[PDB]
Design a protein around this nucleic acid. Structure first.
Ligand SMILES: Cc1cn([C@H]2C[C@H](O)[C@@H](COP(=O)(O)OP(=O)(O)OP(=O)(O)O)O2)c(=O)[nH]c1=O
Ligand SMILES: [Ca+2]
Ligand code: NA
Ligand code: NA
Length: 321
DNA sequence: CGGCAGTACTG
DNA sequence: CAGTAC
DNA sequence: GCCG
């Protein structure tokens, strides 16, 4: 639950304004502060109580106080008039802040302008054609149907293939922004040849409607279940070796902020965590950049990753931040 | 002062 | 590479 | 934006 809604509702506006305008680090600080404020027990009442929470500094506490005594945040009144347009433009899949800012500088103000005059990448044209659909979340039951469709298509090639939807779905959420399907095989090797033939099977069946990204082990695209009343949905599919399964599962399950916290912690302990592996004895320079590789640590299960980092295990539902 | 996660596709 | 995305 |  959140007992600081009257504060966070105002902060989210500012954080989004900073995000679409490209000030990503300031936005990150706002996001983190907003999460910290949602994850609390008591409505904040003092500048001193505010600064005590992790993720809240003097500036953010000043803002919270201006909120408690006045009910309003003056800074909301000086957001640039371009921000709603930038948000509109960057909600196109494949367009971000830089593209939105360029479109805005060219004088474009609406999606009709984009459709008729803008130069679009292949991805951005798919994103525009599904603009409304991609802003919607689906019921988890539909995510289940999409996962089962992928699983049944994959297990037709090799019965031994394991398929797991990993994302807000695995974290137990009632709705899902897209479906994240991780595929492996405990053999350790048969996963190698199935990916392209799987995608051919799904697009031959009419399930896949558009491709966004096509790597050797990574796919991002668009699907739609058959029959009436169905929307187009974003679908991400990864195929990983069994030895990397635990770390791929952890990454793909998220949340994103959870992953960043876990990876930041690993960095403090001279380790490095990615979707491939947890590594130890990684040599870095004075800027936190990697100059030497280190060695992979055995992580047969998600619990092993937590254990090697000195943390208590957190269930997927407990990984929202 | 200066990092803020680590990776992968596109063109 | 810069931009964008998971 | 925050924080070491
Ligand atoms: C966006 C993003 C995702 N991820 C990881 C964590 C996510 O659980 C996983 C899938 O990405 P998403 O599908 O974007 O994450 P989600 O499932 O939580 O969002 P939604 O419910 O709206 O569909 O990828 C990152 O590590 N970093 C990122 O920036
Ligand atoms: Ca998802
Ligand atoms: Na604090
Ligand atoms: Na976008």
């Amino acid at each position: 639950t959140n007992h600081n809604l009257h504060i966070t509702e105002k902060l989210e506006v500012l954080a989004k304004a900073y995000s679409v305008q490209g000030d990503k680090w300031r936005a990150l600080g706002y996001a983190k502060a907003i999460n910290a404020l949602k994850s609390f027990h008591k409505p904040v009442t003092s500048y001193q109580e505010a600064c005590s929470i992790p993720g809240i500094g003097k500036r953010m506490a000043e803002k919270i106080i201006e909120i408690l005594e006045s009910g309003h945040l003056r800074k909301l009144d000086h957001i640039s008039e371009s921000v709603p347009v930038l948000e509109l433009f960057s909600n196109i899949w494949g367009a971000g802040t830089k593209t939105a800012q360029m479109w805005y500088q060219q004088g474009f103000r609406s999606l009709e302008d984009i459709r008729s005059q803008a130069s679009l990448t292949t991805q951005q044209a798919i994103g525009l054609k599904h603009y409304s659909d991609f802003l919607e979340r689906m019921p988890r039951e539909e995510a289940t149907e999409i996962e089962q469709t992928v699983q049944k298509a994959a297990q037709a090639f090799n019965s031994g293939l394991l398929c797991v939807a990993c994302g807000s779905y695995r974290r137990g959420k009632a709705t899902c922004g897209d479906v994240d399907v991780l595929i492996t095989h405990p053999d350790g090797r048969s996963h190698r040849g199935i990916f392209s033939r799987l995608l051919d099977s799904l697009r031959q069946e009419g399930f896949l409607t558009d491709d966004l990204v096509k790597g050797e082990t990574k796919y991002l695209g668009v699907c739609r279940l058959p029959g009436p009343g169905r929307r187009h949905r974003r679908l991400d599919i990864r195929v990983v070796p069994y030895s990397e399964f635990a770390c791929a599962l952890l990454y793909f399950t998220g949340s994103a902020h959870f992953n960043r916290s876990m990876r930041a912690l690993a960095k403090t302990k001279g380790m490095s965590l990615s979707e491939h592996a947890l590594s130890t004895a990684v040599v870095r320079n004075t800027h936190g950049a990697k100059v030497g590789p280190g060695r992979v640590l055995p992580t047969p299960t998600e619990k092993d990753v937590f254990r090697l980092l000195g943390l208590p295990y957190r269930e997927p539902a407990e990984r929202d931040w």
